[PDB]
Ligand binder design. Structure first.
Ligand code: CLA
Ligand code: CLA
Ligand code: CLA
Ligand code: CLA
Ligand code: CLA
Ligand code: CLA
Ligand code: CLA
Ligand code: CLA
Ligand SMILES: CCCCCCCCCCCCCCCC(=O)OC[C@H](COP(=O)(O)OC[C@@H](O)CO)OC(=O)CCCCCCCCCCCCCCC
Ligand SMILES: CC1=C(C/C=C(\C)CCC[C@H](C)CCC[C@H](C)CCCC(C)C)C(=O)c2ccccc2C1=O
Ligand code: SF4
Ligand code: SF4
Lengths: 27, 31, 83, 38, 154, 119, 80, 73, 741, 61
């Protein structure tokens, strides 16, 4: 309903993407 | 409602991510 | 394998002149078989985008000329089987 | 002599018998048609 | 709700529909036509067909349903052809078992199942009629079953 | 190809110019005295050995396994002996003590790098 | 490579070697049978694993068992 | 929340569309308001409507509340 | 040289070997220790080239079996003439053909199935004919029922001559191989005696039976004032009124004044607008042309008199340089092996049957054939499917010749095995053509499918969109419009009305309409080119890789019906030359399913239908092809969904048997899949787990119950895929068009 | 043990496990599987005659 929360969302799932590649390059 | 964001993310994940990810996985066959 | 590629043009007189002087009137060509084509290419040759599917004396005398011309040049290569 | 031995094989007996039971059902369904009771 | 079938209204509507709809084909032929006589016999085969469903239970569809509880008010629906049918395939099963335990001990048992010994076949074909108290008397003898036949690993 | 893969060179001798059939397909001329034949894989070559041997006497034949470093090997014959004929030089490998009936269950081989028949 | 193992049902009737189109199996003189023969599989690097041996193995149950192992160039049997 | 206003009438919308392949006549067959979105035939607005979500704001705080949880896992 | 050398009293005719099932094969007379002996009893029952290698005994067996086939065909045709006699409304149909629907088979009155007796007029009901026999009989000139009873009686008499014939040619007079390899005489009597005298004597029938009778029926005379066909030959005065050229006798024939026979024989073409069929003057003249032309054609084979050819001196003279040896060897190939001859004769027989199908929709040769559309439909369709299957038999029996009867000694450097030297370059370019045509024949349908689905109908391949007007078919079709004045000089009308002038309306029903081919018909032709090239890929892969592939270099040693080699080479399931025939049958079902779906929907939109007054036009689907064949939603909606409405609503009515042959043929179709997907390594110990339940009760069968073999267990999957899949389209077609036509 | 004796088998991988069969051959020449036994019914290879040792060899009376 706003725009800034969408930026905050892709920030948090971009960080979560860094945990995805972080977990991915150890197993 | 940032209506412009699918016009960025749908191409950059729809086509160019299965280009460079083909590169990363397919060179990653030989790494 | 192509041992004798000597001449091609002997088929041309070998195919035009065997169809020019026979008129055989009531068909598409009231004149001969080749005159009805060589007369019907100079109207279209000087950059004409015409010649539709109803253009009988051009399109029909394309295939009915080349299907004997191809066969008579192929038999011209058979004219180097006795060598 | 051996003709009856041909008539004793598997498909010939199976057709002379399933032809017979099929005849039991077809002749027993002209005579008693629409038999949903009993 | 299972109405008795002789007074279900939509059932009688199926009577009117099939008699009249079949009679629409009867409006083509003359009084002595063999086709017309065949539709006379066919209309007979519709009214008899529907009057002989007088004790079924056609529900809201007008279509005669059944009952498989063995209520003994509906035993002629299912349980009487159940006992009849199990008699017929207890016949067939007993004939097949008795014939195989004949030809298991012959000269060439492989040949005996291609070419049936119609002597001994039509012996057992008929002789398996009293199979409840023949299987019950072979079962008490320790002969109906078997023991220590083939099996896989474990 | 011949730059990176093993070409199998069947060499043999005959007596008459007969006609055999290639494993590539189609008939071959069959030089009478002595002739080689570069092939692709071994089943083609020993299929030609069965192609010739079940017809007539073609013996003193064997493929030299051309591998692309250059040297050869000796397949088929191995020991001037036909393989189902018994020579007392072939040392056996590939046997166990009993049938399958004493093979261990794979829940005993589980999490170990053994095989279900090794005992 | 396809590990071919030849068990002690091998009565040495040589339909394995005559059935194998690859000469991975030979016959070995082994004084444990009536015929004195028992097959061996030394050159299993050439073994395709087509199991044409286990077709023509007239033992009780399959003296010669072909376990499908690794897949090299030759064991895959590709032409090129 | 427009669906919350009339849950019988309005169809539950899914995510929007970005096709560059919808030329012109397709887009008239998907406009529901300003959005061209799919119709969410997965029962999700019903369950989120019985949970008590009556806004989009609680959906954003919940979506961040599960990005955090996926970062935890 | 040529002589007749026949062994007499060869095989005793006792019933003794009937008591030994599997007497014929020494690999099979062991007796059944398993149930696979049962099925191999039947698959080896006609491996005549695998009983014994002696070609004499084989050749006696086959040549006597042919008379068994012709015995069944004469029983069948005598069945058709008797069902036309006793059971049919043919005499009533002959009164008004456009009103009375044709029916023979009158279903016995048991429970319900008397509703299958369709009231087809004629004062008698019964299930409707779609085979079109009555249109063959009106063309034949059969007037009343007596000629149908008599011709059925002669059908049984010829059936007795074929049973006694084959009995006489296997047992008590059977020929040597020197009789069989007399092939100059075999062609010399089939080109002349069979086909030549057949067409000549049939021209005799058409001129002295059908021309007067189908002139009297063209005038509209009821079949009571028509005299016997018989009664036209006793005096010419009953034919000189009909054709005055009979008054001159044969004198203008022997004086070569053949202008005088213009009444009997002519070259018109087109269609007779009264009867809706060909002019039988044209058809009788036609069979005289086959008569003289085939009787001339027979005499090119030297037999005894040193006049004519042999096949050997023809084939050896075509020693062209790109083949090297030339055809040196084929006369020894085609006179020693029967599977090779079966490959050629099945290929040409099937392709002749397709040619039959096309020449029966577009030049309907029987009177009132294109006015009852189901007989117009299914006679197209049926001669397609035997037109299809007989091609795959080519791909079977050209494979079998490569496996069984191939011999590299006789076959060394000729035209045959020089193909096999580059069979990778054969199959690789079939592979390229299949993918090119698949993209450009089906990707156009996915394209127009998406463009219609994405709304952008301007970007389709429609009429209005990017047009793909078939240039060559429209052009040569226009040449056929310009046939009868220009090049066919003595013609009057065109070769067909599928090419040229205005349509033919016979009893407010459209006989033939000039078919327009635009930009959808193009793409369906590239379907047909595609699915013909795929079956050619599988059936040339099944012949060139029949014997020694580079995967498995001994298939000649393994056989023809071997399943596989094993899991080695990563698995070689379904690799034999039989298995490519197994796949060619599925692609046969594909290729012909879309040949007939192209037929039965373009000719319900662009040809068939009815007309009203002032020459107005009304198709069955109403022009709904070119806007709808370009997609697949238009295909599946507008054809396989919309045309189902007269099949699916058929219960309670007389078409309902088709509504039973629609559902159950789905069943068998899906019942095929159980045999296709699974394998016998499952079913064998599923079965053996049931054999536990029989061993417990001593109901152990003595013949041990194996599962089916692999090649059987897939062959049955094909043979249900085709019966189920074909019978779906069968009941869908005949249930569709009977409800209209 | 002896020739012709009707023998049930106790090796779980035979096709004829727990089925009696007739002894054809008994060899006394140190063979690990000396007793060639054939049967009534037939396994998948078309081969009733196989051979066995003495431990898997139970006679009856
Ligand atoms: C093999 C099975 C079989 C059996 C058991 C019967 C049994 C019978 N048939 Mg029959 N029938 C059969 C096959 C069979 N039919 C076949 C295949 C046909 C076709 C040719 C007929 C045609 C036929 C007619 C036409 C009649 C019978 C009649 C009869 C009954 C005479 C008493 C009897 C119940 C008669 C009867 O009772 O019907 C009134 C009768 O008129 N049958
Ligand atoms: C396997 C399931 C099944 C079952 C339980 C039934 C059961 C029945 N069907 Mg049936 N049917 C089936 C499958 C089945 N059907 C299928 C798959 C088809 C399609 C081919 C049909 C087609 C069909 C028709 C066309 C008709 C039936 C009819 C009937 C009824 C009477 C049968 C009959 O002829 O009695 C008469 C038979 C006998 C009296 C013989 C028994 C006598 C014994 C053998 C003598 C010895 C006694 C000791 C019965 C309720 C009939 C009916 O009226 O429907 C209600 C009927 O007309 N069925
Ligand atoms: C000799 C006759 C006979 C007998 C007594 C049995 C008995 C049995 N079978 Mg069966 N069976 C038979 C023949 C027979 N079968 C045949 C010929 C086949 C091949 C089609 C099968 C296939 C079969 C399967 C696939 C299964 C059984 C099962 C069973 C058991 C459950 C009952 C059942 O559903 O039957 C099943 C009945 C059928 C599948 C069809 C009936 C079989 C034929 C057509 C009827 C018998 C007629 C026979 C040919 C007569 C021969 C003798 C005569 C010529 C003198 C039961 C012990 C099931 C089981 O294990 O349960 C414990 C099971 O799953 N059977
Ligand atoms: C099984 C445990 C569970 C689960 C899955 C949820 C899930 C949810 N709660 Mg919640 N809640 C829980 C236990 C739980 N609750 C308990 C025990 C309490 C009492 C302290 C609450 C009190 C609570 C409040 C007060 C609110 C939620 C809300 C919500 C929703 C959004 C939460 C967010 O943004 O992050 C979400 C569906 C919010 C909501 O539904 O928005 C209206 C909201 O306002 N919850
Ligand atoms: C001109 C004489 C003549 C005629 C008419 C035929 C006709 C036929 N031959 Mg034939 N044949 C002939 C000479 C002839 N042959 C000669 C000389 C040879 C030796 C080289 C052969 C060798 C031969 C073989 C090897 C085979 C045939 C087959 C066939 C049949 C093909 C099936 C068909 O078209 O169905 C249409 C059917 C008909 C038109 C029915 C025609 C039947 C009538 C009665 C005419 C038959 C005439 C007969 C030869 C007279 C016998 C003479 C004897 C009494 C002394 C067809 C009947 C094939 C076949 O199916 O076997 C029968 C087959 O396999 N023929
Ligand atoms: C609907 C199912 C289906 C489909 C699509 C195919 C398709 C094909 N089969 Mg086939 N086949 C099928 C069922 C099917 N088969 C079945 C059931 C059998 C059982 C008998 C067989 C047996 C069979 C045999 C025996 C052979 C084939 C072969 C072929 C190929 C022919 C060449 C061609 O058309 O290329 C064109 C491709 C198509 C028409 C497929 C659609 C592709 C579209 C048009 C374009 C691509 C879409 C898209 C742009 C992809 C990119 C996007 C994506 C990456 C996200 C083709 C791929 C032959 C082969 O392997 O080599 C020629 C062959 O020899 N098939
Ligand atoms: C295979 C069949 C086929 C064909 C012919 C087309 C053709 C087309 N599609 Mg398409 N499409 C197809 C299948 C096909 N489609 C399928 C299967 C799908 C769904 C998966 C789609 C989905 C699709 C979409 C979504 C769209 C199209 C569009 C288009 C158009 C433009 C595409 C373009 O730029 O071409 C690309 C062409 C090339 C890159 C050139 C390669 C081909 C050249 C000509 C080969 C030449 C080789 C040469 C002859 C070799 C010999 C010479 C040498 C010896 C020197 C064009 C008409 C677009 C449109 O708007 O339509 C108007 C569009 O938006 N298509
Ligand atoms: C003049 C004699 C004559 C007549 C009256 C007919 C009449 C007919 N034929 Mg025909 N036909 C003939 C000779 C004749 N044919 C010859 C000689 C052949 C063999 C080449 C054929 C081969 C043939 C086929 C394959 C078919 C017909 C069909 C038909 C019917 C369709 C109506 C039509 O417009 O056809 C007009 C007929 C023609 C235009 C055919 C002309 C054939 C010429 C005479 C061939 C001359 C050969 C000669 C050696 C020169 C060769 C070179 C040449 C090609 C330039 C009609 C009854 C069709 C049918 O069955 O109807 C359902 C059909 O499918 N015919
Ligand atoms: C048919 C025309 C094919 C040209 C072949 C030319 C031709 O027949 O030359 C004839 C040549 C044989 O040369 P010879 O002089 O040896 O021929 C004499 C002997 O063959 C007979 O004894 O055949 C081949 O070399 C075939 C080459 C395959 C050529 C590949 C193309 C064939 C497949 C393409 C089909 C195209 C159909 C297109 C329709 C428009
Ligand atoms: C179901 C199935 C079977 C089992 C099929 C069984 C064995 C055959 C069932 C049909 C036979 C004919 C039934 C036998 C019935 C006899 C005819 C006797 C019955 C009495 C009368 C019918 C005469 C396979 O063997 C198989 C093999 C390979 C791939 C797939 C499959 C597969 O899908
Ligand atoms: S194992 Fe079977 S095949 Fe191999 S040798 Fe002994 S018997 Fe012959
Ligand atoms: S594995 Fe395949 S190749 Fe090796 S032996 Fe057994 S069968 Fe012959």
């Amino acid at each position: 309903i706003t725009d800034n929360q969408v930026f905050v969302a892709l920030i948090m799932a971009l960080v979560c993407g860094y945990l995805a590649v972080k977990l991915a390059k150890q197993l | 409602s940032a209506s412009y964001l699918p016009s960025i993310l749908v191409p950059t994940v729809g086509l160019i991510l299965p280009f460079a990810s083909m590169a990363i996985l397919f060179i990653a066959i030989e790494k | 394998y192509p041992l004798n590629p000597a001449v091609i043009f002997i088929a041309l007189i070998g195919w035009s002149a065997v169809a020019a002087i026979p008129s055989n009137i009531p068909v598409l060509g009231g004149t001969g078989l080749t005159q009805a084509f060589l007369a019907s290419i100079q109207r279209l040759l000087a950059q004409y985008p015409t010649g539709p599917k109803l253009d009988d004396p051009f399109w029909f005398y394309l295939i009915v000329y080349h299907v004997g011309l191809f066969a008579l040049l192929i038999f011209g290569q058979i004219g180097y089987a006795g060598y | 002599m051996n003709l009856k031995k041909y008539l004793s094989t598997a498909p010939v007996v199976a057709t002379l018998w399933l032809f017979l039971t099929a005849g039991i059902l077809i002749e027993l369904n002209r005579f008693f048609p629409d038999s949903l009771f009993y | 709700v299972l109405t008795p079938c002789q007074q279900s209204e939509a059932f009688h509507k199926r009577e009117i529909n099939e008699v009249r709809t079949l009679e629409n084909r009867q409006a083509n032929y003359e009084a002595n036509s063999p086709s017309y006589l065949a539709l006379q016999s066919q209309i007979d085969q519709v009214h008899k067909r529907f009057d002989k469903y007088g004790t079924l239970l056609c529900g809201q569809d007008g279509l005669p349903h059944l009952i498989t509880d063995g209520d003994w008010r509906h035993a002629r629906e299912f349980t009487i052809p159940a006992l009849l049918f199990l008699y017929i395939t207890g016949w067939i099963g007993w004939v097949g078992r008795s014939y195989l335990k004949y030809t298991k001990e012959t000269k060439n048992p492989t040949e005996q199942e291609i070419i049936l010994d119609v002597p001994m076949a039509l012996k057992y074909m008929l002789s398996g009629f009293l199979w409840p108290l023949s299987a019950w008397q072979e079962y008490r003898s320790g002969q109906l079953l078997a023991k220590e036949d083939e099996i896989t690993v474990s | 190809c011949a730059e990176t893969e093993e070409k199998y060179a069947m060499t043999w001798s005959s007596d008459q110019q007969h006609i055999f059939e290639m494993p590539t397909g189609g008939a071959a001329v069959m030089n009478s005295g002595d002739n080689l034949l570069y092939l692709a894989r071994k089943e083609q070559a020993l299929a030609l050995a069965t192609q010739l041997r079940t017809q007539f006497k073609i013996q003193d034949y064997k493929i030299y396994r051309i591998f692309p470093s250059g040297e050869v090997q000796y397949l088929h014959p191995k020991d001037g002996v036909l393989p189902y004929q018994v020579n007392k030089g072939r040392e056996q490998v590939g046997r166990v003590k009993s049938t399958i009936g004493k093979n261990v269950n794979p829940a005993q081989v589980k999490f170990t790098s053994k095989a279900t028949y090794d005992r | 490579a396809h590990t071919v193992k030849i068990y002690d049902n091998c009565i040495g009737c040589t339909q394995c070697v005559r059935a194998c189109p690859l000469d991975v199996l030979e016959m070995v003189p082994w004084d444990g049978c009536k015929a004195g023969q028992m097959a061996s599989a030394p050159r299993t690097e050439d073994c395709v694993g087509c199991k044409r041996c286990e077709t023509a193995c007239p033992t009780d149950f399959l003296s010669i068992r072909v376990y499908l192992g690794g897949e090299t160039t030759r064991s895959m049997g590709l032409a090129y | 929340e427009q669906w919350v206003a009339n849950p019988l009438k309005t169809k539950p919308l899914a995510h929007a569309i970005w096709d560059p392949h919808f030329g012109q006549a397709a887009l008239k067959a998907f406009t529901r308001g300003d959005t061209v979105a799919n119709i969410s035939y997965s029962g999700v607005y019903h369950w989120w409507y019985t949970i008590g979500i009556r806004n989009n704001v609680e959906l954003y705080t919940g979506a961040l509340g599960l990005l955090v949880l996926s970062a935890v896992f | 040289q040529v002589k007749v050398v026949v062994d007499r009293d060869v095989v005793p005719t006792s019933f003794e070997k009937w008591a030994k099932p599997g007497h014929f094969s020494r690999s099979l007379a062991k007796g059944p220790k398993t149930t696979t002996w049962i099925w191999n009893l039947h698959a080896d029952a006609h491996d005549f080239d695998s009983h014994t290698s002696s070609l004499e005994e084989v050749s006696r067996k086959i040549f006597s079996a042919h008379f068994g086939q012709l015995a069944i065909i004469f029983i069948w045709l005598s069945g058709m003439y008797f069902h036309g006699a006793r059971f049919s409304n043919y005499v009533a149909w002959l009164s008004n053909p456009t009103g009375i629907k044709p029916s023979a088979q009158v279903v016995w009155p048991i429970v319900g199935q008397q509703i299958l007796n369709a009231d087809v007029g004629g004062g008698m009901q019964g299930i409707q004919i779609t085979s079109g026999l009555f249109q063959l009989w009106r063309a034949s000139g059969i007037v009343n029922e007596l000629q149908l009873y008599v011709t059925a009686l002669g059908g049984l008499g010829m059936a007795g001559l074929m049973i006694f014939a084959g009995w006489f040619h296997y047992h008590k007079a059977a020929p040597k191989l020197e009789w069989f390899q007399n092939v100059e005489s075999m062609l010399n009597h089939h080109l002349a005696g069979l086909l030549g005298l057949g067409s000549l004597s049939w021209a005799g029938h058409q001129i002295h039976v059908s021309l007067p009778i189908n002139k009297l029926l063209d005038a509209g005379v009821a079949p009571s004032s028509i005299p016997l066909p018989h009664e036209f030959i006793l005096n010419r005065n009953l034919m000189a009124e009909l054709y005055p050229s009979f008054q001159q006798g044969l004198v203008p024939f022997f004086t070569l004044n053949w202008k005088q026979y213009s009444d009997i024989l002519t070259f018109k073409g087109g269609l007779s607008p009264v009867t809706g069929g060909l002019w039988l003057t044209d058809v009788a003249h036609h069979h005289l042309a086959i008569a003289v032309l085939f009787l001339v054609a027979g005499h090119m084979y030297r037999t005894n008199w040193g006049i004519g050819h042999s096949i050997k001196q023809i084939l050896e003279a075509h020693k062209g340089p790109l083949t090297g040896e030339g055809h040196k060897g084929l006369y020894e190939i085609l006179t020693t092996s029967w599977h090779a001859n079966l490959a050629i004769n099945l290929a040409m027989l099937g392709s002749l049957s397709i040619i039959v199908a096309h020449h029966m929709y577009a030049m309907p040769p029987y009177p009132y054939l294109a006015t009852d559309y189901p007989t117009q439909l299914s006679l197209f369709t049926h001669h397609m499917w035997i037109g299809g299957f007989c091609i795959v038999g080519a791909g079977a029996h050209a494979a079998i010749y490569m496996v069984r009867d191939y011999s590299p000694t006789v076959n060394f450097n000729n035209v045959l095995d020089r193909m096999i030297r580059h069979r990778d370059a054969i199959i690789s370019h079939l592979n390229w053509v299949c993918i090119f045509l698949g993209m450009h024949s089906f990707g156009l349908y996915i394209h127009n499918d998406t463009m219609r689905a994405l709304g952008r109908a301007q970007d389709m391949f429609s009429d209005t969109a990017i047009q793909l007007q078939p240039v060559f078919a429209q052009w040569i079709q226009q040449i056929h419009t310009l046939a009868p004045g220009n090049t066919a000089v003595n013609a009057l009308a065109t070769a067909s009305y599928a090419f040229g002038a205005d349509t033919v309306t016979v009893g407010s029903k459209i006989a033939m309409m000039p078919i327009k081919l635009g930009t959808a018909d193009f793409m369906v032709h590239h379907i047909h080119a595609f699915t013909i090239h795929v079956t050619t890929l599988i059936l040339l892969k099944g012949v060139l890789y029949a014997r020694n592939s580079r995967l498995i270099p001994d298939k000649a040693n393994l056989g023809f019906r071997f399943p596989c080699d094993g899991p080695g080479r990563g698995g070689t399931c379904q690799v034999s030359a039989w298995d490519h025939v197994f796949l060619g049958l599925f692609w046969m079902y594909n290729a012909l399913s879309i040949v007939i779906f192209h037929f039965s929907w373009k000719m319900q939109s662009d040809v068939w239908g009815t007309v009203t007054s002032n020459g107005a036009i009304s198709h069955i689907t109403g022009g709904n092809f070119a806007q709808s064949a370009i997609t697949i939603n238009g295909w599946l909606r507008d054809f396989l969904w919309a045309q189902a409405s007269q099949v699916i609503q058929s219960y309670g009515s007389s078409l309902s048997a088709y509504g039973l042959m629609f559902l159950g043929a789905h069943f068998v179709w899906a019942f095929s899949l159980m045999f296709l997907f699974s394998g016998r390594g499952y079913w064998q110990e599923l079965i053996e787990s049931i054999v536990w339940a029989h061993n417990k009760l001593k109901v152990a069968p003595a013949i041990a119950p194996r599962a089916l073999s692999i090649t059987q267990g897939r062959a049955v999957g094909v043979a249900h895929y085709l019966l189920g899949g074909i019978a779906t389209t069968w009941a869908f077609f005949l249930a569709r068009i009977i409800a209209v036509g | 043990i002896k020739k012709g004796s009707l023998v049930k088998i106790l090796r779980p991988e035979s096709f004829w496990y727990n089925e009696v069969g007739t002894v054809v051959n008994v060899e006394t020449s140190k063979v690990l599987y000396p007793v060639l036994v054939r049967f009534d019914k037939v396994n998948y290879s078309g081969l009733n005659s196989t051979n066995f040792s003495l431990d898997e060899l139970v006679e009856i009376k």
